Amino acid sequence: XXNXXYX
Amino acid sequence: XXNXXYX
Ligand SMILES: *[C@@H]1O[C@H](CO)[C@@H](O)[C@H](O)[C@H]1O[C@@H]1O[C@@H](C)[C@H](O)[C@@H](O)[C@H]1O
Ligand SMILES: *[C@@H]1O[C@H](CO)[C@@H](O)[C@H](O)[C@H]1O[C@@H]1O[C@@H](C)[C@H](O)[C@@H](O)[C@H]1O
Numbered sequence: 001x002x003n004x005x006y007x
Numbered sequence: 008x009x010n011x012x013y014x
């Protein structure tokens with residue numbers, strides 16, 4: 001992945 | 008805080 005969140 | 012990231 002690589003991005004983060006949280007959705 | 009409470010949200011995430013990463014910026
Ligand atoms: C999310 O990333 C931060 C920044 O590096 C790290 O300190 C947290 O341990 C990390 O969260 C975990 O890992 C991710 C892969 C899971 O989605 C999240 O629930 C948590 O286990
Ligand atoms: C969230 O990411 C910060 C960096 O921005 C990292 O220093 C924290 O340890 C990380 O939080 C941990 O992981 C998340 C997923 C949890 O909600 C939090 O309680 C904490 O364990």
Ligand SMILES: *[C@H]1C[C@](C)(N)[C@@H](O)[C@H](C)O1
Nearest residue numbers: 005006007008009010011
């Ligand atoms: C990460 C944190 C958040 C944005 N407050 C939550 O709504 C999500 C489900 O997880």
Ligand SMILES: *[C@H]1C[C@](C)(N)[C@@H](O)[C@H](C)O1
Nearest residue numbers: 001002003004012013014
């Ligand atoms: C979180 C992940 C990211 C957007 N790939 C990175 O650029 C940032 C510094 O931390």
